[PDB]
Amino acid sequence: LDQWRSRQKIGMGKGARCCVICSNQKALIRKYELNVCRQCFRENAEHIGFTKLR
Amino acid sequence: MSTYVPKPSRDNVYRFFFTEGVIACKKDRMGTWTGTLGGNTFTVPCIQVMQLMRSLKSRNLIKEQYAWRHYYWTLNDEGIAYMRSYLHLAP
Amino acid sequence: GQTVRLTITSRNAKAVESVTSQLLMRARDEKVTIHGPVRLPTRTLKITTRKTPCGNGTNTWDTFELKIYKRIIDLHAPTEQVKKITSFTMESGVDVSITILD
Amino acid sequence: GPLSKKRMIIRDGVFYAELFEFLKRELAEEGFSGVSYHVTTLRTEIVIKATKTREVLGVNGRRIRELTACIQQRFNYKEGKLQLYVERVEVRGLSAMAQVESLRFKLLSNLQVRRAAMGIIRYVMESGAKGCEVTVGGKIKGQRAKSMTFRDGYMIKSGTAHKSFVDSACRHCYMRAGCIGVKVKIMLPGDSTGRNGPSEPLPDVITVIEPK
RNA sequence: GGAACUUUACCAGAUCCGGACAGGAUGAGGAUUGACAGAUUGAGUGUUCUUUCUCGAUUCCCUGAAUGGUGGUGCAUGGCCGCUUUUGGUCGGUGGAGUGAUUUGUUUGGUUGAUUCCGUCAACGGACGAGAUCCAAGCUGCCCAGUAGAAUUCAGAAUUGCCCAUAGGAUAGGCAUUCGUCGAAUUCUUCUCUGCGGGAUUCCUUGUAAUGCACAAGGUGAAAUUUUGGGCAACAGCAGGUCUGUGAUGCUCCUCAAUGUUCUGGGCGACACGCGCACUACAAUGUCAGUGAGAACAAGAAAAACGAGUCGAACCUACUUGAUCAAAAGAGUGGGGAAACCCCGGAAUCACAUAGACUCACUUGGGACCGAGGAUUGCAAUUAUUGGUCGCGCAACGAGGAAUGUCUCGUAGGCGCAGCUCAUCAAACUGUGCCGAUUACGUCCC
Ligand SMILES: NC[C@@H]1O[C@H](O[C@H]2[C@@H](O)[C@H](O[C@@H]3[C@@H](O)[C@H](N)C[C@H](N)[C@H]3O[C@H]3O[C@H](CO)[C@@H](O)[C@H](O)[C@H]3N)O[C@@H]2CO)[C@H](N)[C@@H](O)[C@@H]1O
Ligand SMILES: [Mg+2]
Ligand SMILES: [Mg+2]
Ligand SMILES: [Mg+2]
Ligand SMILES: [Mg+2]
């Protein structure tokens, strides 16, 4: 029966969110509605445009 | 959903995939896929497009590369010649 | 006048001046009576993550920044004369925006 | 509704970051070397830098045709909005991203690790580079992993000016016994126009001028 | 890593295949999909058994396989990080030395934070690290503003003097002053914003040193010695951490009652106890109740969805209301894509001649513990999500044993505020401002 992903249909939680690069749902940067995982961002900060000035 | 793909969907996905040549589909297993034959009316779920293409690649008909969260599937020289027989088209 | 405001926004500091000074040097040739290019405050964008992908070590951090450069120019030309000022192939990464004031 | 200017610099960065990852995976054996995209009304430009322009283009453009519509179907562009081009790198020896993908194939074709890496550095240093550094790390010799670096010429590393002068790219080589990672760093020589290398000299070179 | 579900990796169950593709036997005279009512069940879960219709080659049954795993091994690896190390260190070439490992360069002398420099010198020429470059703060030029502000001049309005608080001190003084007054004008860049640029160099001065490299004191100045504060950092290495970040990975385990994946319910949070780290205090340099003056960094709404290629609603917010009567709410109505609205950002320490209560007590200190209403977040509040109201306060705690941590100026300490986690929740962390010291400017004792 299609009770199949009934908890993942409603999208309120930490499981509904996801790293858009790296498919993980642990420790994502949601500031500026960025939605990249913590580790998968530092690999990609230069292409997004962030550079560590200080 | 279900990887049980209906026959009116499979030929409708193949009609798009021979025409444009490529299908890009998100890895989201609760979301749809939308393609266009002028009417943009497919609303095929993404679960079934993965199943259709995993059957194709196992028959070594397509070339798959995967970006961040999107698949990108392309027809081959054998794959175009195979796709024409399923849709019954002139070369 | 129609008082069209062009918004020059960019991520590069050297590309936002090479558009604005070029866009201004166009709008002197038709004698448009511009109100000069003002420098709106640059907005820096901080994401301060950990450095480690694991958990251990000294808890070190690294702040990333991203500055948005922002310029506006007001000019009294009609709406197809400002498209003469606007139309030139710019540098990549500079957004221009045409807005009509009142 | 429109997003704020702060919200649009984000989505324009994540656009370029995702576009860069797709072409890095596709065009690895086409010698891919970067993207620049130019957006305006009526068309969105994408220029692809490569070393093998007969291969990133198809027989009649077939390869870039498929590679166009992969970007179109993903990012929901409409017909006429998205046009792609291919430009070639003029030097091929000053592009660290191209040389590391070739060094990836020199190992995957079962050649010797040190013979492959000096073949890069001979080719990079004859191409006018001021210096080069190849690091191969992994299970080179046996069960336990080693690291070897191979060096020639100058190499600036501690400044924040090394982002301007040193070109770097790291890929993974998937051996039969494990995983090897290769790195290639190339110090850009010259090219005051910005063809490959900065206009200004190094931050500590003084170069007093001679009087007339 | 602030987990209610999810997250999730754990436990008790229950589904689903997301076992592709091959090869072999059933197969359209049907391979099979799905489900109403009952029984089964935790389940108005077709999971299954009864019942019969739908689906129409997608499947299913065997065999071989393959793909999934937050399964294992970080002592098989890549990558990144940490740490050796806040240190001044490493490397060739060619010459010299030695049978050789190896030396020399790379140094005994002064000097600097610095193998930083000067001098010497069997070495001479180079490369990296250091310095430089980069960011931020302080003073400043040009440019600049119906997204920043200012003055003026006419009009409009307000006070206008004889006034000495109940007991009433200290303290500036041609044309008096004040401004949703949601006024008109007409001149400006003083402050504001900011792209590139000036300015600082031991520059000048007179003891240390004695050629030199430099040093101390003072000048100059906005700034005086790496100007301040950070970023970046070589070469080697650790059998440090991460296979719980990845569609990073090799090997190996599990692989249809699966260690896959989803539901449902628990758990991660359970308390004789031992420790790290905060928070709150032990009060009168205070608690309370008033009243005043008054910050900086910042955030802010949505999709190929559902609605009217364009527009709405999700986000933050002022303002009214609720209000012929508690908070917390709940509602209207505006505005804002964020220098344009919040906003003249009314932070909290502080302040006050407030003629305010307490008066040295476990007390009006402290607010742990828990009782009873109530209202919001959520699909769900029980093992109180959170706020607010009245109780409890008879819970230690009166300044802390042996020990121990951080710090040299807008600093320590105190004080709050943003952002980040976030539907709801900060005793956290990343930032920012406010108030603002004691001591040293030394040494090798540990
Ligand atoms: N990259 C700078 C490094 O500074 C090192 O030297 C540093 C040390 O001698 C010394 O650093 C000390 C540090 O040792 C000790 N553990 C703590 C002390 N606060 C530091 O002091 C330094 O930093 C702080 C800035 O917050 C200042 O108070 C002080 O002026 C400064 N001397 O001061 C120097 C920093 O200016 C080394 N010379 C070298 O590793 C390197 O050059
Ligand atoms: Mg948000
Ligand atoms: Mg073409
Ligand atoms: Mg020798
Ligand atoms: Mg004791």
Tokens of D141: 């010799």
**Amino acid letter, residue D80:** G
Q: Do D6 and C43 touch (CB under 8 A)?
A: yes
Q: In angstroms, rounded to a whole number, what is the distance separating the alpha carbons of residues D162 and D182? A: 20
Phi, psi of B49 (to 5 degrees): -70, -30
- Å between CA of C100 and C1' of E4: 52
- Å between CA of C50 and C1' of E367: 38
Q: Do C68 and D37 touch (CB under 8 A)?
A: no
Tokens of C23: 């866009």
The domain made up of D1-90 is a member of CATH 3.60.15.10:
no
CA angle C98, C99, D1 (to 5 degrees): 105
Q: In angstroms, rounded to a whole number, what is the distance separating the alpha carbons of residues D178 and D139? A: 7
Q: In angstroms, rounded to a whole number, what is the distance separating the alpha carbons of residues D58 and A29? A: 39
Instruction: Write out the H or E segment, with its range, that includes residue D131.
Output: strand D131-138
Q: Compute the distance from residue B3 Cα to the ligand 5 centre, in Å.
A: 70
Note whether C35 contacts D: Cβ–Cβ < 8 A.
Answer: no
- Identify the closest residue of chain A to C65 by CA–CA distance: A50
Task: Kindly report the nearest CA distance between residue A13 and chain C, in angstroms.
Answer: 22
Quote the number of domains for chain A. Answer: 1
Question: Which positions in chain B touch D70 (Cβ < 8 Å)?
Answer: 22, 24, 72, 74
The resolution, in angstroms to one decimal, equals: 2.7
Quote the number of domains for chain B. Answer: 1
Tokens of C64: 């990333």
Q: CATH no. for residue A21?
A: 4.10.830.10
Task: Kindly report the nearest CA distance between residue D72 and chain B, in angstroms.
Answer: 9
Chains contacting B (3+ CB pairs below 8 angstroms): A, D
Q: Parallel, antiparallel, or unpaired: how do β-strands D43-50 and D82-88 relate?
A: parallel
Quote the number of domains for chain C. Answer: 1
Tell me which nucleotides of strand E come within 7 A of a protein CB. 1, 3, 5-8, 15-18, 20-22, 33-35, 43, 45-47, 55-59, 66, 70, 76-83, 127-136, 143-147, 193-196, 229-237, 239-242, 245-251, 262-264, 298-304, 309, 337-339, 378-380, 419-423, 429-431
The domain made up of D91-212 is a member of CATH 3.30.1140.32:
yes
Domain boundaries defined on chain D: 1-90, 91-212
Query: Nearest by CB to D38, which of C11, C45, C92?
Result: C92
- Whether A4 and B1 have beta carbons less than 8 Å apart is answered as yes
- Identify the closest residue of chain A to D15 by CA–CA distance: A48
Residue A37 belongs to what domain range?
A: 1-54
D window 11-70, beta carbon within 8 A of A: 13-14, 16-18, 20-21
**Three-class HEC string of chain B:** CCCCCCHHHHHHHHHHHHHCCEEEEECCCCCEECCCCCCCCCCEEHHHHHHHHHHHHHCCCEEEEECCCEEEEEECHHHHHHHHHHHCCCC
Which residue shows structure tokens 């790195």? Answer: D183
Note whether B4 contacts A: Cβ–Cβ < 8 A.
Answer: no
Chains C and D contact (Cβ–Cβ under 8 Å for 3 or more pairs): yes
Which residue shows structure tokens 């998100």? Answer: B26
Q: In angstroms, rounded to a whole number, what is the distance separating the alpha carbons of residues C85 and C6? A: 10
**Amino acid letter, residue D195:** R
Cβ-proximal residues to D62 (8 Å cutoff; 6+ apart), any chain: none
Torsion of the alpha carbons at B71, B77, B82 and B86, rounded to the nearest 10: 70
- Going by the DSSP 8-state scheme, the letter that residue A26 receives in this structure is S
- Identify the closest residue of chain A to D161 by CA–CA distance: A53
Question: Which positions in chain D touch C95 (Cβ < 8 Å)?
Answer: 5, 8
- Whether D9 and C70 have beta carbons less than 8 Å apart is answered as no
Cβ-proximal residues to B84 (8 Å cutoff; 6+ apart), any chain: B18, B91
Question: Which positions in chain D touch B74 (Cβ < 8 Å)?
Answer: 66, 70
Nearest CA-CA partner of D35 in D47, D17, D50, D52: D47
Question: Which positions in chain C touch A36 (Cβ < 8 Å)?
Answer: none
Task: Tell me, rounded to whole angstroms, the distance of Cα C72 from its chain centroid.
Answer: 8
Tokens of D87: 């430009």
Q: In angstroms, rounded to a whole number, what is the distance separating the alpha carbons of residues C47 and A41? A: 10
- Å between CA of A1 and C1' of E52: 20
Task: Kindly report the nearest CA distance between residue D14 and chain A, in angstroms.
Answer: 5
- Whether D95 and D188 have beta carbons less than 8 Å apart is answered as no
Closest-lying nucleotide for B35 based on CA to C1':
E304
Map residue C72 onto helix, strand or coil.
strand
Residue C39 belongs to what domain range?
A: 1-102
Instruction: Write out the H or E segment, with its range, that includes residue D73.
Output: helix D62-75
Task: Tell me, rounded to whole angstroms, the distance of Cα D165 from its chain centroid.
Answer: 14
Nearest CA-CA partner of B67 in D102, C98, A40, C26: A40
